Chains A and B, each alone.
Chain A
Amino acid sequence: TTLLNPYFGEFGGMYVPQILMPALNQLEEAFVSAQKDPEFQAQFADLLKNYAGRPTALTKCQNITAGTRTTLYLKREDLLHGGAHKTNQVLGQALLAKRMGKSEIIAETGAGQHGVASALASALLGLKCRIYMGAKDVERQSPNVFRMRLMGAEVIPVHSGSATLKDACNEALRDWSGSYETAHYMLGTAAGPHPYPTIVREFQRMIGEETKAQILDKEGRLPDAVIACVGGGSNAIGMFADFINDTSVGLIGVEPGGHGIETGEHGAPLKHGRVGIYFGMKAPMMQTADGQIEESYSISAGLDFPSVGPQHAYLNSIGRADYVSITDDEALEAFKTLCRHEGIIPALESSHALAHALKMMREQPEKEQLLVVNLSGRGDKDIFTVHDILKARGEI
C-alpha cells in the first residue's frame, strides 16, 4: 500500500528487501506531507535562493550558433552552489530528513559529485553525513573525496564486488536496512525504489519551471526542444518535468556512448540495455546475458551508471521523450567549443547534451529551432581529464 503510484507504466516499483519497506513508506508519507506544507516549501525555497543561488541564469549562446537558424540557450546549473544541479535536491532531502527526525545522512557516490552535494547540505543543516564510495572511485576522485572530508563527511571506501558505484549503492542500502530509524538515505539520482524517482524529480523540477519562465520572457514562446544528459536521470527529469504537458516541446535525453555503442563500452542502458530488476527498481540496465549487472563506461564519471531512472524509460516507451547517445569524442569537442566560443567550461556530463544540440544545429543549419541545453554543471573538475586526453592524442 502506497500513497503515490510507484510505477511509470511497467517501470519503477519498490524492489527492496522486506525490512526496508517501512523506511520507504515512512519517506513517502513524509514527502507527501512536506509537499502540502507551506512552511516546508518556504524553507526549501529560502535555501535554494539565498544559499544555493537560484534562480540560475538562462544564457543565450550567440557565437556557437552563428550562421545557422538555431537559437541556443544554456540553463546555467553550472552557476549553482557546488557547481552542479545536484545541490537542489540534496537540500530538499536534507529538509525531509529533519522533518522525519533523522540526524544522520547516508549517501552513495561514484564520481564524487553527489557525495560533495550530500556533504555540503549535511554541513549546512547540521546532519552527520556518511558517504559510501567504491574503492576504485575513491582512487580516481581524490579532489572530491577531500571536499567531502573538508565538509565534515565520513567517506567509507567500498571494496566488495567491482568496487564502484553499484557496489557503493549496495553498501548504502545494507547500512540503511539496519539504521533507518536514525539515518536517512539521501539517494543521488531519479532512480532507485519508490519514492525516490518521484522525490528527486519534484526537488529538481525548478530547473524546468525557471527555464519555461525565462524563455517565455526572452523569446515569447516555448522551446522547440530541451536537451539534457542522462546518467541516472535527475537533471534531465528536472528540466523535462514542467514541459511534459506542453506536447509541442521536444524532450531529448542524451546517454553516454563512450567509445561507441557498437564497442559495448558505453553507458546507454535506456536504448541499448535490457530491462532488469535491481537498484530497487524495474528499469533498463546493462547486464550479462545471464542477468549479472554489468559495467558501463563514459569519459564522464558522472554518467557512468549502468541503469536509468524509470520515468525516463516510461517517457521513452510512450514516445513523449526521445533518447540518443553521444560519444566521448563528441562530448570532448563540445567541451572545447563552449570554452573557446562562449567562455564557459562545461562539465563533461553536460557536454554530452551540448554535443547533441550542436549536432542538431550542424546537421540541419537552415532549420529554425529554439533549443535549451541543461548545462547541469561546470567543468573545472574535468580539466585534468581533458588535458590528459588532449596530450595523449597529440593535441598538447
Chain B
Amino acid sequence: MERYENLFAQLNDRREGAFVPFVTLGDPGIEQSLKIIDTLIDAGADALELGVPFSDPLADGPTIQNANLRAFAAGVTPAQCFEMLALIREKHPTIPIGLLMYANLVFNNGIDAFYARCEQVGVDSVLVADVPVEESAPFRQAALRHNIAPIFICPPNADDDLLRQVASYGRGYTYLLSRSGVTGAENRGALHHLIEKLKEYHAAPALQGFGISSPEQVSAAVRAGAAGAISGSAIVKIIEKNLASPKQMLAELRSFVSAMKAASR
C-alpha cells in the first residue's frame, strides 16, 4: 500500500494542500472518539494523525496532555487503540493513517511486533516522538519491513546533516516543525530554506505542524511550498470545550475541519 503517495499525487493533480487533523484515540471515550474521527473525515480531512494515550507525553503541551488523561479516565489501552484503528481502516480504505507514539509503547512488547500490528490494522506511518533520527535505526527498519512509513521531525534549527538524514530516512511525509517547545495552539510558529533543501534532497513531502489553528496558516504553509498542514491542539480544544455537549462537539468539529480544509486550495 502507498496511501501517502496516492494522496499526494491526487492533491498535486488538484493543486491542493493536505489538511491533517490530530486527535487522541479514545478521547473522551472509545465510541465518541470513533464518531469524532468519522466527522473529521466527513468534513474533509485528507489524512489522520492519531495519538495512543501514554502516561508521560513529554512532547505535548497542556491541551493534548489533557486529552490523554481523558482517554485514561475512560480506560483506553493500546490494545483498544489498535482495535479502533482496524475499524477506522475498514470504514475508510484510502485515507492515510499515521500514529503519534512515544517510544516505550513501541518498544514495550517488541519493536518488530509493534510495527507488525500497525501493518495488520492498516496504519500507514508512525512518528515516535522521543526517538531522534540519531536513535532511529531499529524503528525505521522495523517500520519499512512492515510497509510502515517512519516519520521524522525536521526542526527549525536543522543543520544540513539533519536535513540529509531526515530526507534519507523518512517516508510518507516529512514533519516540518514550525518552532521549538511543545505542542499547543497558544504558541504559534514560523521556512523557504528548509522546504527547498528537503525538495533538493528528495525528502518525503513536507507537512507543517505545531500551532496550526487558523485557516490562513494552512494557506500560508502550502504557499511556502509545504504539501499541507497538521493541526492538533486546535481540534482537541473543540473536544475539550464540548465534553458536556456530544452533538454540539461533532458540529463544531465539522465546521472547523471544513474551514481548515477549504483553506488548502
Contacts and interface: CB of A to CB of B under 8 A. Distances in A.
Contact of B134 (A1, A19, A278, A292): A1
A52 B219 CA distance: 58
A277 B132 contact: no
Given A277-B107, A280-B130, A290-B78, A18 B180 contact: no
B131 interface: yes
SS of A interface (majority): mixed
Interface residues of A, number: 32
B155 A276 contact: no
B152 interface: yes
B65 A178 contact: no
Interface string B49-60: 000001111110
Interface residues of B, number: 38
B181 A177 contact: yes
Contacts of A151: none
Contacts of B6: none
A257 interface: no
A167 B60 CA distance: 12
Nearest to B62: A160
B134 A167 contact: no
Nearest to B77: A290
Nearest to B111: A277
A65 interface: no
A370 interface: no
Interface string A1-32: 10000000000011111111110000000000
Interface in B51-84: 54-59, 61-62, 65, 69, 77-79
B175 to A, nearest CB: 9
B78 A277 contact: no
A19 B178 CA distance: 11
Give the 7 A-B residue pairs with the shortest CB-CB distance, closest first: A291-B108, A178-B181, A277-B103, A292-B55, A18-B153, A170-B58, A276-B104
Interface of A: 1, 13-22, 160-162, 166-167, 169-170, 173-174, 177-178, 276-278, 280, 282, 287, 290-293
Interface of B: 54-59, 61-62, 65, 69, 77-79, 102-105, 107-109, 129-135, 152-155, 157, 161-162, 177, 180-182
